[PDB]
């Protein structure tokens, strides 16, 4: 009844997107049928944020599934939770995007985008008071990247006073060997800087390293990477889905998290880190607090000690002492005060939700707007320039109508972003 519209785009976007629906549907007591079989009414009080009700007391994700090839969507459909999704919200083409941002944004994607907007519009029109949109996608491929950014631009045209939120998956050569990813991602970041209000930087570099170094998985799969993504996504959406004081809608989060409109790229973090394998000792509140702020628990590969936190939100789940939570939270700030900008007083805000995630007695999710996120953008930028200075691989893009100029503006805008962060790390 403050409604969110979810869209998932491309391979990655739909993979993490389906995972998201599996996990929260379980947290809200909804089964693949769409039938509620839970034992508490916290589960239902705010269900209409993410689900429409249907006849037979049926709950149906407010979810649009977009791709330019079918592969992944067929997989969603005949998977476990596939029956839960509204069939006419599956919107797909046949040709695919060949990891090519230009195909996704300008050629192949344009052919399909109006159909997606028809479905978005139908879902918007039956919302008591729509708050905005959330999108899941990668930035290194073509559909999620180029088409997903194209959609963002068009949604903002029709709904310019609604909030736009992305879970954007940032590429890393530790996970993909596709050579043009830095292109597709620099081009996407340009879009996100201008047209989203909140972006969760979910860095495939960090997810891989957490899987290998910490979880001792010698051969990480996308399944292992995604388990981390779904846990983070459950965590960062908890204040929107359950009854609560703080960051209970997208706009309020935005207001608390974004001091400057361009600096809306968040480092998420999760504790305790787990692989898909039972965790038998519950964490103490001090442990959650120390872990959630640990660099090794960050889903964006940045060293938080290399920058300064503009704003933080922390979300603690499970039955625990609020007193201990406040003491520990306060203790992180007072022991490391120098990493928290002094010109934004009381910049850390903390929420506690009694329902834990499945699997855990206790958990914490960290959302940080820190200036160290530049390291991520510099990395993408270094990879971009290495190719761009020899105009390499550009024919794949100019062949779809693009000019070099457009690459140059994008590189520039992301380098401006980086230096604005630097600006505030030294203030």
């Amino acid at each position: 009844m403050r409604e969110i519209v979810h869209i998932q785009a491309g391979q990655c976007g739909n993979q993490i997107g389906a995972k998201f629906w599996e996990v929260i549907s379980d947290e809200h007591g909804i089964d693949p049928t769409g039938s509620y079989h839970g034992d508490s009414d916290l589960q239902l009080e705010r269900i209409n944020v993410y689900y429409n009700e249907a006849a037979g007391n049926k709950y149906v994700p407010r979810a649009i599934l977009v791709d330019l090839e079918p592969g992944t969507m067929d997989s969603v459909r005949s998977g476990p939770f596939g029956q839960i999704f509204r069939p006419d919200n599956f919107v797909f083409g046949q040709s695919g995007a060949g990891n090519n941002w230009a195909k996704g944004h300008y050629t192949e994607g344009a052919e399909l985008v109006d159909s997606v907007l028809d479905v978005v519009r139908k879902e918007s029109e039956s919302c008591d008071c729509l708050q905005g949109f959330q999108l899941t996608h990668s930035l290194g491929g073509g559909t999620g990247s180029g088409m997903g950014t194209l959609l963002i631009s068009k949604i903002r045209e029709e709904y310019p006073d609604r909030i736009m939120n992305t879970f954007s998956v940032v590429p890393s050569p530790k996970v993909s060997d596709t050579v043009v990813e830095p292109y597709n991602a620099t081009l996407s970041v340009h879009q996100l800087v201008e047209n989203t209000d909140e972006t969760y930087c979910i860095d495939n570099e960090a997810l891989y390293d957490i899987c290998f170094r910490t979880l001792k998985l010698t051969t990480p799969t996308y399944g292992d990477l995604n388990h981390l993504v779904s846990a983070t996504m459950s965590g960062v959406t908890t204040c929107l889905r359950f009854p609560g004081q703080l960051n209970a809608d997208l706009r309020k989060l935005a207001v608390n998290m974004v001091p400057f409109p361009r600096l809306h790229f968040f480092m998420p973090g999760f504790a305790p880190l787990t692989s898909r394998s039972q965790q038998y000792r519950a964490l103490t509140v001090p442990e959650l607090t120390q872990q959630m702020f640990d660099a090794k628990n960050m889903m964006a590969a940045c060293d938080p000690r290399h920058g300064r936190y503009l704003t933080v939100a922390a979300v603690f789940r499970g039955r625990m002492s609020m007193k201990e939570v406040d003491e520990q939270m306060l203790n992180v700030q007072n022991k490391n005060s120098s990493y928290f900008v002094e010109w934004i007083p009381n910049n850390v805000k903390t929420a506690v939700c009694d329902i834990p995630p499945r699997g855990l007695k206790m958990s914490a999710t960290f959302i940080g707007n820190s200036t160290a996120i530049q390291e991520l953008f510099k990395r993408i930028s270094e990879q971009f320039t290495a190719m761009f200075r020899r105009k390499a691989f550009l024919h794949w893009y100019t062949g779809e109508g693009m000019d070099e100029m457009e690459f140059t503006e994008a590189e520039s805008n992301m380098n401006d972003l980086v230096s604005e962060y630097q600006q505030y790390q030294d203030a």
Binding site: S153, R156, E157, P160, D161
Partner: protein, 54 residues
């Protein structure tokens, strides 16, 4: 020191004790207020829509 104004009733009582003596915007201006803000929002939204059209 000096008690005064002693008032008593069924509910209670009151008095004073003294230790020491001494030694607007119009309806119009508002409706305007609101309307200039809204015009500025409209301009900002229009500029964005102009930009998105480009």
């Amino acid at each position: 020191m000096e008690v005064i104004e002693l008032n008593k009733c069924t509910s209670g009582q009151s008095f004073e004790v003294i230790l020491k003596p001494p030694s607007d915007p119009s309806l119009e201006e508002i409706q305007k207020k609101l309307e200039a803000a809204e015009e500025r929002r409209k301009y900002q939204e229009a500029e964005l829509l102009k930009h998105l059209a480009e």
